[PDB]
Assembly symmetry: C3
Homo-oligomer: 320 residues x 3
């Protein structure tokens, strides 16, 4: 007769723990995001073999772009190339572009590691280096690694405020991340205050265990996660978020592939009756906010189906 | 014996209503959006305490930006500051920036309400107002409220067409929002025509019950919801959307936080061998389309499971 | 007694096939995308009745825009209009804009096919064609169809590399699209190599059965689908993606509506103390990556619920 109560205890345990008497629903979410703070750049670069001093300040109009859905981007490093006009010009001398005769490169060949189409005229470029000119923006963007000291090493001191508004369309529930009458002068910390939305980039990066400086060379993809586990019943009602973070970039890289998250960005300007761009190579840690959650109620149909399913165990106990 | 039939009536009621014999599947959607119409601006502004006249016309290339996933943005108000070059200049005189001696502000101090880094030299700025210059774009954007009559008050007269294409990967179903052969010369109205996808911004704003002019000062976050509840069975087949709207912005605000949905945008231009931007403070009502729905079929496993579950009530009625 | 074993066979078949003993979880994904390759343009255009030669090269900074969430865009065709200053000028002569007297058009009338607000002065525009000037950017963008040979017909030769990182927050599982130690020098093909993420635009368009050249006139919306069906149990563990493609654009169009996916893009520049833009009409096939998947485990509660549900059939077989 011991199993006659043991089965009951097991069904009670499962019903209380898994919340089978609750009908779960999607989440529907909208994310609002503000990145604040400024950075200051003062350093030295080697462009085209010539030393130059980069000094200045970048504010909220410089180190980001208008919000792209549930995400936001932050400048981290850049390579600048000014005054590029369409024409024919030798490209950057690499292993696949060096030539000693015009026959070395064929006109119209589009090696998937260049910018432009070659014409097949191996001319000198610099220090008697023979390469065959391509039709593209001149001067051709020299292929070089990002500077070892990240230009925006101060970017880890930035702050970000996140407002999440989730919905449960099955029920009549729509709720926000920040409750009214709550202090905003604060910072996020798992133990000190896990409800404050203000996240510190240094903090989010150090919690995962990755040093910001290392990853600032080429950037990466970061994710914040907001989990919502909301009980909509009149009793034991609570709907509150939990914050976690992790790296969506592989971090292991590969010889064929390339680490970081980088892209090239264009800025056109006509001058002297000529057209010329100012494209920049851009390394920047794109953030992806990932918000997900569940919410149940007391729909009696689920309760009935589960009770009727578990009644057979009551039967079987007497059967055996 | 009355319960013997009452149970049967309950189970039938539950099966017909909740559609337990239907295996539900999530939704995969793609949103296409077009915002049309033009606006005209003719007003007066007080910039740097000088009166100026702003007159002109904004068209689809001006009052928006390229679509960002399942969303679209509309210009509502802006504050323009032209000709800003990098250099050291006094900032806007506020409570936290006013000084009487160089000792009042320390060099390198980055108060999180400023643009640029002070050097510690409290000089006059205007009307014998001593503030200490910071290194940033000059002249420093003066902190001012948006004008009381919203520059684009005509923006409520714009129209938006929405094409939703949803998928149900579990089944072989992919459908669209607009059926072929359906008039497009129309406007949305819950009673007149709830299938026409052309929404009027004044209409969507007024349905929720918020006046456009008040929210147009600082903007906010709007959301359209498209609910799909599609029955894929041969019999009683129907798959049609329903439109609803609501405000994802808090609308209650806070003294620490700030209402509306605003951001600063940059437009760079080199002139006289100097670099200068034209950054604009932007207030604009970001729209977020939220599309969700369910679709099921006649998978017999679900039917078998439910019927076996509910058989225990038939037996318990005889038990009791 | 045959049914006594037939029922057991059916329950075993259902449990093995549908995987009822697995608790399914949603998917949380992040998409990284790279589009590579270059294009060359050399053609002739008829702008304002005058022949011109368009020759040049477009690289990764020209034929796209920064990634917008889980999507990417590719230039396909464009109509350029340079030097547009704000002022009053006659618009493009169409059926609704031609007038013979000033009374034909009323000042302040905003026909929803125009750019600018008319003033009601029917003056000559070209070849003794009388239209009434509107206040907008001049010269008014002439309404013309895209060139019959698509300018970027070579865009089908582009390659795209996709890195998908999905999560199963219910379990402790986060995985990537590309496994380590896997060749990247390859191309996608359903039979040759369905794991290589490098997709060829000509390939993706031809698999669906749509010629690239025809859709390149006005563009369209393309969709890649990545299906993940991952078994997280220790035995029979596998978690691998499958690639499919389809057209989210209607492709049937309508007289009232308009085919393709086009938008107008703005590029401002101040010159001669005047403001002027360089807005371009843009036709480009927007790509929408759609990633979805399921993953289950061996939660015993689901197993117990299903077994209890199906025990009733064991009972009913003896009942009948
Ligand atoms: C030196 C350098 N290389 C970059 N990417 N190089 C790639 C990038 C790739 S990719 O990940 O397939 O885009 C390479 C791919 C293959 N492959 O065939 O598998 C071979 C190679 S390769 O090392 O032999 O030339 C690939 C090389 C990059 C990033 O890609 P990209 O600039 O060449 O477009 C940067 C960025 O600054 C860079 O500075
Ligand atoms: C006058 C004015 N103030 C703005 N934001 N002000 C904030 C904004 C914020 S924020 O919501 O935390 O970004 C403030 C936050 C705190 N706080 O510590 O909780 C204190 C304050 S404060 O009122 O004492 O200076 C905060 C003040 C804003 C919007 O933020 P911002 O321009 O300062 O970056 C505007 C925009 O037009 C504006 O015109
Ligand atoms: C010649 C031409 N027409 C375009 N769109 N035309 C529309 C576009 C539309 S729309 O799909 O409702 O935006 C039209 C809608 C309606 N309608 O009331 O249902 C009537 C008409 S109409 O043919 O009589 O003028 C609509 C016409 C377009 C695309 O829209 P748009 O440039 O006019 O803003 C292009 C693009 O280059 C174009 O070259
Ligand atoms: C961030 O700010 C603190 C406060 O002044 C400063 O001590 C620290 O050096 C800053 N971080 C970096 C990387 O400079
Ligand atoms: C918020 O924080 C401030 C100081 O940071 C403190 O004085 C105040 O009591 C806190 N609570 C409220 C409700 O302001
Ligand atoms: C919207 O257009 C109508 C039609 O002319 C006009 O009466 C109304 O004033 C416009 N809205 C605003 C805010 O001007
Ligand atoms: C559409 O509307 C027009 C007028 O708005 C009307 O003449 C026509 O009959 C309607 N139906 C169709 C199919 O065009
Ligand atoms: C794509 O590249 C191949 C390889 O040279 C070439 O034969 C083909 O013509 C190119 N496609 C187009 C549309 O030109
Ligand atoms: C990858 O491909 C290259 C040639 O495309 C081949 O030589 C090599 O064996 C392949 N495998 C690895 C692991 O490199």
């Amino acid at each position: 007769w011991i199993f006659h109560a043991l089965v009951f205890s097991y069904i009670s345990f499962a019903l209380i723990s898994d919340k089978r008497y609750q009908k779960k629903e999607p989440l529907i979410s909208s994310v609002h995001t503000k990145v604040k703070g400024i950075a200051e750049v003062k350093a030295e670069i080697l462009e085209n073999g010539m030393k130059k001093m980069v000094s200045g300040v970048f504010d909220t109009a410089d180190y980001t772009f208008p919000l792209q859905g549930n995400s936001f981007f932050v400048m981290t490093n850049f390579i600048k190339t000014e005054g590029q006009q369409q024409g024919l010009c030798p490209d950057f001398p690499t292993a696949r572009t060096i030539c000693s005769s015009d026959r070395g490169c064929k006109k119209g060949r589009m090696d998937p590691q260049s910018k432009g189409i070659q014409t097949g005229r191996c001319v000198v470029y610099k220090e008697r280096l023979k390469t065959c000119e391509v039709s593209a923006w001149c001067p051709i963007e020299e292929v070089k690694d990002a500077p070892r000291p990240a230009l925006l090493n101060s970017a880890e001191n930035f702050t970000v405020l996140i407002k999440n508004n989730i919905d449960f369309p099955g029920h009549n529930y729509t709720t926000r991340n920040i409750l009214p009458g709550v202090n905003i002068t604060c910072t996020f910390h798992k133990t000190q205050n896990p409800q404050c939305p203000i996240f510190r980039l240094g903090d989010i990066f150090q919690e995962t265990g990755d040093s910001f400086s290392d990853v600032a060379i080429q950037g990466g993809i970061m994710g914040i996660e907001i989990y919502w586990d909301c009980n909509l019943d009149g009793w034991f009602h609570h709907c509150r978020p939990k914050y976690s973070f992790r790296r969506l970039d592989d971090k292991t890289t590969s010889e064929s592939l390339y680490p970081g998250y980088n892209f090239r960005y264009a800025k056109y300007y006509k001058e002297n009756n000529v057209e010329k761009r100012t494209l920049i190579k851009v390394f920047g840690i794109r953030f992806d906010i990932l918000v997900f959650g569940t919410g149940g109620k007391f729909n009696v149909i689920q309760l009935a189906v589960y009770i009727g399913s578990v009644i057979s165990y009551f039967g079987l106990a007497t059967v055996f």
